[PDB]
A paper describes a structure:
Neutralizing antibodies (nAbs), which show efficacy for prophylactic as well as therapeutic use, are being developed against the spike (S) protein of SARS-CoV-2 (1–8). Many SARS-CoV-2 neutralizing antibodies (nAbs) lose potency against variants of concern. Therefore, with the objective of overcoming current and future VOCs, we extensively screened SARS-CoV-2 nAbs obtained from dozens of convalescent donors to identify potent antibodies insensitive to amino acid substitutions in the RBD. Structural and functional analyses of antibodies screened using both potency assays and the yeast RBD library revealed rare, ultrapotent, mutation-resistant nAbs against SARS-CoV-2.
Specifically, residues I28 and Y32 of CDRH1 form 3 hydrogen bonds with G413 and D427 of the RBD. Interestingly, in addition to forming a salt bridge (between Y103 of CDRH3 and K378 of RBD), CDRH3 interacts with the planar backbone conformation of the RBD via 8 hydrogen bonds. However, the D427 residue, which plays a critical role in stabilizing S trimers, is conserved across MERS-CoV, SARS-CoV-1, and SARS-CoV-2 (37), and may have a low mutation rate. D427 and D428 specifically interact with K986, which electrostatically stabilizes the spike in the closed state. The loss of such electrostatic contacts switches the S protein’s dynamic equilibrium by promoting a large allosteric change, and shifts the spike toward the open trimer state, which is unfavorable for the viruses.
Author numbering:
A (entry chain A): 333 to 528
B (entry chain L): 1 to 213
C (entry chain H): 1 to 231
């Protein structure tokens, strides 16, 4: 039994853009979730529908780890029942979410002195995402009555915006890395267990 | 589990910082970190400003902060603005497993600009007169501060009888509204040259007049 | 979007009961606890209790124990608050509020949520006095109600009891320039209010203006057409 590759998710060199959030399937391993919940370096650690101190007792078919970067002020949107540009247009948790939301300030990794333009989020969308939906499209968004038909213009917008993270930003405008753990139980051998 | 104690009122000037206290007991505010603060504007449902002592929900400005020491929680509003004028309520979990609100605090933002009332006067409708009644309706809005005197006249003489006037009520833009109604018989209405609603606000007066047709 | 839509204002005699509904939409109803908070006119907020729709568990303030019943109908995503043996001191706006989901922290301790969405409120008035539906009269536009490009017209909502009365214009199509004034309480014990709307003066010949008066305590609605006078 390998120990689960949590370092792979949490210590990855670069994170996904929130609009193109990464998902990793975890399987066939032992998870000491204590490595996460006993860490003092996470600024957000919130579990819905389950206590993280009970996870070491349990077995799952698979564990999913979604990861991305957003700004500090937006971490609040990564929870059931939220609204705003992130929850509505980028990463949506369902109302009946069971899992953990873990975040930490990543200014030292992700901000860059001239601005990191490489982290993006969707600013405009026709409708809200469904829970766990991912939209990587890049069609021009019609904000007014006249159609754009593929052409950028006034009230005809490119749908994404760049964060521009700089180390001198206020903390709410600094980058945070986020991992969301969800749990899948199926009719199969449980491939992910704690020490039980 | 008894209403938490808050000052009845606080006032500050724009740009200033103010603090609203909320004093409970070891069974509630002092017993848990589950203190919230809600803002309530006139005629509106309350709105969450602060939860868990110091966290803000998305959309609430960082001008709002919270803290707690012993049995007393504190809401602080920095960079005070006109739009912060509202009632504020603290809210806490209790050892009974129930939740309890504080008594509330009315926040006044001082130094707001004097604003003169707009006055509209309507005479009795044909329909009402045909029903053998008559009501003059004097509608008074957008004044600041919230104190007016309303006088009625029949021709040039004061009328006291049949007058009903509201207390001023706070509008959403922080200004005030009020109305005054004069009840007459159709005979009275028809037997004078005119009636007037005269509104005095900060020593200046706006008077509207209507006459029978 | 999350919506909580409550039942209309009610009037009740002392000793009667009232059942207020709160109809949820725009989210998974069973995932969030609902609370009832009330507020007597001009007074503070008061927490009454909560229901968890997923397990049908309830918890009430000691003050209401034995007299409040909170229920839920998952087939219509509706929460109900039934308050029995009413007295004058139960006169209040009753709100339903959704509690955002709570969570477990790192150490395994539970943290409750907070109120993230609210119903519009339901005024329940408890009185021995008789209910009275309003008489509605038009407040026609005229030269002493014009401010040039715009003119003022309205409806007088006379002699009703109890509160409240709501007024819309053109079935909610007309919202700009609408000011509904708080009511006066007359020495008769009956209320009157007025609603006025400011509109383009050139529209007066051509656009129809109807005020939609709603007095739910008497189950009365009046739609009154307001026209320029003849003279
Ligand atoms: C989940 C995981 O493997 N976390 C480790 C953690 O022990 C260490 O403190 C951090 C420092 O970069 O590197 C990572």
């Amino acid at each position: 039994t390998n120990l689960c590759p949590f370092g792979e998710v949490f210590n990855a060199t670069r994170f996904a853009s929130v609009y193109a959030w990464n998902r990793k399937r975890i399987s066939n391993c032992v998870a000491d979730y204590s490595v996460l919940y006993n860490s003092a370096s996470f600024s957000t650690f919130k579990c819905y529908g389950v206590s993280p101190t009970k996870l070491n007792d349990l077995c799952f078919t698979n564990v999913y780890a979604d990861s991305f970067v957003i700004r500090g002020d937006e971490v609040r949107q990564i929870a059931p029942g939220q609204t705003g540009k992130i929850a509505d247009y980028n990463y949506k948790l369902p109302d009946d979410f069971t899992g953990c939301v873990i975040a930490w300030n990543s200014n030292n990794l992700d901000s860059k002195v001239g601005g990191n333009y490489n982290y993006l989020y969707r600013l405009f969308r026709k409708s809200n995402l469904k829970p766990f939906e991912r939209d990587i499209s890049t069609e021009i968004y019609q904000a007014g009555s006249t159609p754009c038909n593929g052409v950028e213009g006034f009230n005809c917008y490119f749908p994404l915006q760049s964060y521009g993270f700089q180390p001198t930003n206020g903390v709410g405008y600094q980058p945070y890395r986020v991992v969301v753990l969800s749990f899948e139980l199926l009719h199969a051998p449980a491939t992910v267990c704690g020490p039980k | 589990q008894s209403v938490l104690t808050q000052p009845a009122s606080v006032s500050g000037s724009p740009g200033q910082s103010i603090t609203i206290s909320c004093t409970g007991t070891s069974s509630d505010v002092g017993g848990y970190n589950f203190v919230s603060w809600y803002q309530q504007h006139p005629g509106k449902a309350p709105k969450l400003m602060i939860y868990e002592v110091s966290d803000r929900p998305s959309g609430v400005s960082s001008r709002f902060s919270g803290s707690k020491s012993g049995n007393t929680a504190s809401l602080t509003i920095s960079g005070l603005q006109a739009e912060d004028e509202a009632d504020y309520y603290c809210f806490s979990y209790t050892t009974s497993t129930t939740w309890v609100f504080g008594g509330g605090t009315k926040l006044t933002v001082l130094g707001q600009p004097k604003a003169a009332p707009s006055v509209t006067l309507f005479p009795p409708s044909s329909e009402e007169l045909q029903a053998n009644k008559a009501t003059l309706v004097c509608l008074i809005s957008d004044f600041y501060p919230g104190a007016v005197t309303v006088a009625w006249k029949a021709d040039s003489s004061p009328v006291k009888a049949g007058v009903e006037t509201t207390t001023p009520s706070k509008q959403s833009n922080n200004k005030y509204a009020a109305s005054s109604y004069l009840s007459l018989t159709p005979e009275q209405w028809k037997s004078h040259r005119s009636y007037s609603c005269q509104v005095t606000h900060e020593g200046s007066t706006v008077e509207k007049t209507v006459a029978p047709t | 979007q999350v919506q909580l839509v409550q039942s209309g204002a009610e009037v009740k005699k002392p000793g009667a009961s009232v059942k207020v509904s709160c109809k949820a939409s725009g989210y998974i109803f069973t995932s969030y606890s609902m609370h009832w908070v009330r507020q007597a006119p001009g007074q503070g907020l008061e927490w009454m209790g909560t229901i968890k729709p997923s397990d049908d568990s309830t918890n009430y303030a000691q003050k209401f124990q034995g007299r409040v019943s909170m229920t839920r109908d998952t087939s219509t995503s509706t929460v109900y608050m039934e308050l029995s043996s009413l007295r004058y001191e139960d006169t209040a706006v009753y709100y339903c509020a959704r509690e955002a989901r709570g969570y477990y922290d790192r150490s395994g301790y539970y943290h409750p949520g907070y109120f993230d969405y609210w119903g519009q409120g339901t005024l329940v008035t408890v009185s021995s006095a008789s209910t009275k539906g309003p008489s509605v009269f038009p407040l026609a536009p005229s030269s002493k109600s014009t401010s040039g490009g715009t003119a003022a017209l309205g409806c007088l909502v006379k002699d009703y009891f109890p509160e409240p009365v709501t007024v819309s214009w053109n079935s909610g199509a007309l919202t700009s320039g609408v000011h509904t004034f708080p009511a006066v309480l007359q020495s008769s014990g009956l209320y009157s209010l007025s609603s006025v709307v400011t509109v383009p003066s050139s529209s007066l010949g051509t656009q129809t203006y109807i005020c939609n008066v709603n007095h739910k305590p008497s189950n009365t609605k009046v739609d009154k057409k307001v026209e320029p006078k003849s003279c």
